[PDB]
Design a protein around this ligand. Sequence first.
Ligand SMILES: [Ca+2]
Length: 263
Amino acid sequence: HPETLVKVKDAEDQLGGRVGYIELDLASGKILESFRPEERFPMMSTFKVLLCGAVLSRVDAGQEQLGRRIHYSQNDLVEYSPVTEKHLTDGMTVGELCSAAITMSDNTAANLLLTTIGGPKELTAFLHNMGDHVTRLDSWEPELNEAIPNDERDTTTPVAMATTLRKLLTGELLTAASRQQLIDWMEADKVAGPLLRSALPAGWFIADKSGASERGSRGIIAALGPDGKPSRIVVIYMTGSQATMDERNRQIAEIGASLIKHW
Ligand SMILES: [Ca+2]
């Protein structure tokens, strides 16, 4: 198994475009290794974790309740809404919407949640307000993913995303209950099987969120580690290529095999 940085560089050689990577120690926050750490990449659906961090932060501030039920209508439904499209009559709670956004990548759920906070500009404000002056959300779904043509809109860097994710999952920017809730949602991801999960040994813990565009881009953010406990944050982004989805997925899975085999 190639060394992880060797493998990242090889992935980029085979795919074209750029591959960005970072691995942080969860406890300490130290950067363990990286490639293109400060370069921008489209977030795609990886932003949905950040969105639910902002929602949880409002819960912690007494401004939102996870049990608050949101009714919506057919005209709110956008592409790739596998959970929300099934709840037109009953609606969904805020907590259900975060579960759908994170675990199923549901786009209408993400839009509804963005509305709760006032839109993409307000998510960017949340990020700024937690010390992430890099990451930006500009668009709603489905414009955001299924292709962000490479502007700086809707981008992050590997290090900004990793850093921000660690600040949401550890420390005290969220309460203990909210930090746990966020990681629970990510552990329950159902749509990232072909990625890091494909390389994960029995007994490990992973909490993740993936992203994709039709053409060009892919990504994943994760907290993972052996023995049931996450101990590192890994962020991988891909953009700018003409590679197939199967090729993007395989290269992420192969990067994952390297980082597990060298753990
Ligand atoms: Ca290169």
